Structure formats: C-alpha cells, structure tokens
C-alpha cells in the first residue's frame, strides 16, 4: 500500500556465525547469512512454499530418480561471472569431498545422489558424484533411489552454489568480505565480529527488480531479554526466535500484533555423548530420560507453546504420523523416578558418589534457564544420585565442542532442512556427518535404508516409525520439546508470515511500510 522511502531493517541473528562458507557450517545463524548472499536451484516465499531460484524450470522422471534443472542463461554472480551448471557441479562435489570436512557432507547421501556416500567414505573421487552439467545451463541430478521430495531438499544452505572460478583461484580465503562473490539478493557491506553484519543490494541478482529492502543489519545478541530491550528501544525491528518466558504474557498483551509465534518443525533435546563413559551405558541414558519431566520445562520454565516430546522426529512432520511416543511417557513421574533411581544404583551411584556431569549449552539465558531446571529435576527426582554442572560456551565454540565430542551432555536443537521425516531420521544414521551424539545402531541404519526403497508414503512412514522405536529403546538422546519460534516483529515490517515451518527470513521477502 504505502512503502517507506528508506527500506532498511535490523534483525537479531542471535550469534556470531561460524563461517560464511556454506560448506563449513551447520547452524541457523550461518544459514541466515548464506541465504542472503547465495541462492540454490530453488528457494522459498514467506510461508516456505517453493519458488524458482537459480533454476527457472525443472522436471523429474516418473521414477523420481532423475532431476533436471534449467538454469537462467543470463544470470551472473555479483562480480559479473556467469552462473552456470558447472558452479553447481563444483559446489556439490566440494560438499562431499572429505578434504572439505563439511558438517553437512552427508546431505547429498540423504538426497541419494549416485556415489555420494562412497565419496564421503573416500571410496570414490568427488568427480564421480552423480551430478552433471549436461550443458552450461542444464544441471542433472541422478539418484539411486526414488526421492520425490528432491526439490525441497535443494533449498538447503549446503546445496547453495559457489563461484568456482573465484573459489579455485582464492581457496578458503574466497569467504573474506573483500573477496565474497554470490548470486543471492544481497552482498556483504561490512562485518564486525560479535557486533554486526551489514548487507547491501546485489544489483546483479536475477530478481533484483523484485527486491525491496535496500540494506540490512544482522545483530549478534545472545540473550533474549537483551534482544527484547533493544526492540523496545526501537534499535532493531525483528528479534531472534527466543523471548524471555517471564515477559512473554506481558509482551503478548502490550505489543499485540507484534508477537509472532511460528509452529516449527524442530526438536529441542539434550544429546548424550554415546561413546563417552558413562553415557555409553544404555541403563544410564534410560535413567536420564525417565527422571526428566518435560512438562516442567514446557509449562513452567518456557510456557510459550512449546510441546513436550519423547522422540526426535516431530510427529506432525510429513510422513511422521505413525511415530509413537514411548510407553514410559504415559507412566506417573513417581514410577519413572523409582525406575531411574534403581538403574542409577545398579550402575553404582549414591548420594555420596552421585553421577556427575556438565550440560554444555551455547550462551543464552533461555538455555541456562532450561539447564537449571533439568539439573534441578535430575538431582531432586533421583534423591541426590545425579549432580549436574552448567557449561555455557559462545556459539562457535559450542558447535566445535559438540563436533569434537568434547562434552558429556549438550543442549541441541534440530530444525528441519525440508518438510519430510527423514530430515530428522537421517541425523542418527551411524555414518551421518550430522550425528554428534555418536549414536550407532546397525538396526537403526537398516530401518532407514529400507525406507529409501519404499514407493509409497505409508511404507516410508512405517519405516520411520520403526527407526524412532529403535532410537527410543536405545535412549540415544533426551528429547524434550517441539519448538515454537516466538519473535517480536515491528508493525512496519511486512513479509514475515508466522507460517513458515522452517521460519526462514529472506530479506528479499520483506518490505517496510509507512
């Protein structure tokens, strides 16, 4: 109706990102940046519905095994280089190349691309990956099993293209702000570590004509109450997706029309280090699960719409409907707690010699609050048999610690990469690059492997239900809740729906009104 003349926006991105290289990262802060600077084959509107990206058209064979993408013949990188199918081949090869050490190396195995797993395992060379430039503007993906959800998988940050000629010339130094070249709607204007990232329009973006926001700042505010205070002072326009539980009822009523709450495809858990004593003991992992009351966390600590869960996959995801919550979750807490105490005593713990460990979490007052509640319930519910310390680390360090296995128990959130159960299922494959729990059950792997041959939704859904049952019986992690994403958004910011199940923010989807 009435567009503002300025079109500037300030968004809390919540943390300093590990990297602006989409092959070196696996987190939300990092994808939020990468999604402004780069664009894959296909992208999303404000509600997460798929629309053309670098590919203007695409099709599949009826067996869902061959996917052909038609790239834009005149599209250019921000430096004027042509965007071609060779950039996609280059990037996707780099993702699976063991030498890249990519956290999301396994993603192309999830897409069942021919030879992706063998390349990840070092059995074949990256050039053997089953993707090709049939010509400069025709990118073809060959899958070994049917992947009817292939198009949605292509929207992930790990499958963004890279400027081959730049990256080959400059190596990993391509990522420096002076050198960064991309094909998204924006480019880096400035980066001050722990303070701000500044974006400006990429005028060579194929769809720059439809981009409205001229400039934006991403802040790196870790604590939700700091986020909210800055918002109230008018110094930022959209919070990150955490709000203080103590302010929440007040904010809803006082700032009516500004509090969004997106129901998202996400699970909050404590991940147990399955290879580090004593979490290699299933009996101890079971005790931890029995004695944690999820309702305390969702109803009393947070209370924002988060729902209790005892499984990893959100059961409301596409093809997740057959997954069952485990039986113990229907037992009284008193029965659960007695079982837990017996398991811990059987494992040699006492009030005098309690089970001692640290909860690792990324600095964030909401995570601290949940960790305090967890440590408090574990101690009290086991009559002193568990004694928990808290360890906060900066986001980057926290991610590094989880990946290096330098942890006992770690706060962990997984948000869907695509709206289908396997984005969760695939995480716990023994060979998954995403599996920082070091969970490994050949029967789990077989259940998921059998899913990928299935030709029907019911057949897939049944296999996923079996996988969750195996992971559940192994007590591999401690699932706690399914996310909502509470955010404050100024009334002058439009294009944020509150209905995107992955709650992406593309600057090119926003606009400021007067």
TrEMBL record:
Name this polypeptide is given: Periplasmic oligopeptide-binding protein
Keywords of the record: Signal, Transport
InterPro entries: Peptide/Ni-bd, SBP_5, SBP_5_CS, SBP_5_dom
Single GO MF annotation: peptide transmembrane transporter activity
Main location: other
An annotated GO cellular component: ATP-binding cassette (ABC) transporter complex
Highest taxon listed in the record's lineage: Bacteria
Transmembrane segments: none
Solute-binding protein family domain sequence ranges: 49-435
Keyword Transport in annotation: yes
Family the entry assigns: Belongs to the bacterial solute-binding protein 5 family.
Subcellular locations according to the entry: Cell envelope
GO BP terms: peptide transport
Listed PANTHER family: PERIPLASMIC BINDING COMPONENT OF ABC TRANSPORTER (PTHR30290), PERIPLASMIC OLIGOPEPTIDE-BINDING PROTEIN-RELATED (PTHR30290:SF10)
């Amino acid at each position: 109706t009435q567009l503002d003349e300025k079109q500037h926006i300030v968004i809390n991105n919540g943390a300093e990102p590990q990297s602006f290289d989409p092959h070196k990262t696996e987190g939300v802060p990092e994808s939020n940046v990468a999604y402004q600077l780069l664009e894959g084959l296909v992208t999303s509107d404000s509600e997460g519905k798929l629309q053309p990206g670098a590919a203007e058209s695409w099709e599949n064979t009826p067996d869902f095994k061959t996917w052909t993408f038609h790239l834009r013949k005149d599209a250019k990188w921000s430096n004027g280089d042509p965007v071609t199918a060779h950039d996609f081949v280059f990037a996707w090869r780099r993702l699976v190349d063991p030498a890249t050490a990519a956290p999301y190396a396994s993603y192309l195995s999830y897409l069942q691309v021919e030879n992706a797993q063998d390349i990840i395992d070092g059995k074949k060379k990256p050039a053997e990956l089953g993707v090709e430039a049939k010509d400069d503007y025709t990118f073809v993906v060959h899958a070994t099993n049917p992947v009817p959800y292939a198009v949605s998988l292509t929207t992930h940050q790990s499958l963004l293209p890279l400027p081959q000629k730049v990256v080959e010339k400059l190596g990993d130094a391509w990522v420096k702000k002076e050198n960064y070249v991309g094909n998204g709607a924006y480019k880096l204007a400035n980066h001050i570590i722990n303070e701000k990232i500044e974006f400006e329009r990429n005028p060579l973006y194929w769809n720059d004509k439809e981009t409205v926001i001229n400039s934006a700042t991403f802040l790196a505010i870790e604590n939700p109450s700091t986020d909210v205070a800055r918002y109230r002072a008018g110094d930022l326009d959209m919070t990150s997706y955490g709000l203080p539980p103590e302010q929440f009822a007040k904010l809803k009523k006082e700032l009516l029309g500004e509090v969004y709450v997106t129901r998202t495809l996400g699970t909050y858990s404590y991940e147990l280090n399955n290879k580090k004593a004593p979490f290699d003991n299933v009996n101890i992992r079971k005790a931890l699960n029995l004695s944690l009351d999820r309702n305390v966390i969702t109803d009393k600590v947070l209370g924002q719409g988060q729902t209790p869960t005892y499984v990893f996959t959100p059961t409301y995801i596409e093809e997740g409907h057959l997954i069952q919550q485990p039986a113990y979750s229907k037992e009284p807490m008193a029965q659960r707690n007695e079982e837990a105490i017996k398991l811990l005593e059987e494992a040699g713990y006492s009030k005098a010699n309690p089970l001692k460990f640290s909860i690792l979490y990324n600095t964030n007052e909401n995570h601290k609050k949940v960790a305090i509640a967890a440590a408090s319930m574990w101690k009290a519910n086991t009559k002193g048999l568990i004694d928990v310390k808290l360890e906060n680390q900066e986001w980057k360090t926290y991610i590094d610690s989880r990946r290096a296995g330098r942890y006992d128990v770690a706060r962990a959130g997984w948000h869907a990469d695509y709206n289908q159960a396997t984005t969760f299922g695939n995480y716990f494959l023994s060979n998954s690059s995403n599996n920082t729990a070091k969970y490994a059950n050949p029967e789990y792997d077989k259940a998921m492997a059998e899913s990928y041959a299935a030709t029907d939704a019911e057949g897939r859904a049944k296999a996923y239900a079996k996988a969750e049952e195996i992971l559940g019986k192994d007590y591999g992690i401690v699932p706690i809740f399914n996310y909502v994403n509470p955010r404050l958004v100024k009334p002058y910011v439009k294009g944020y729906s509150g209905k995107d199940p992955q709650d992406h923010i593309y600057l090119r989807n926003l606009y400021i009104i007067k």
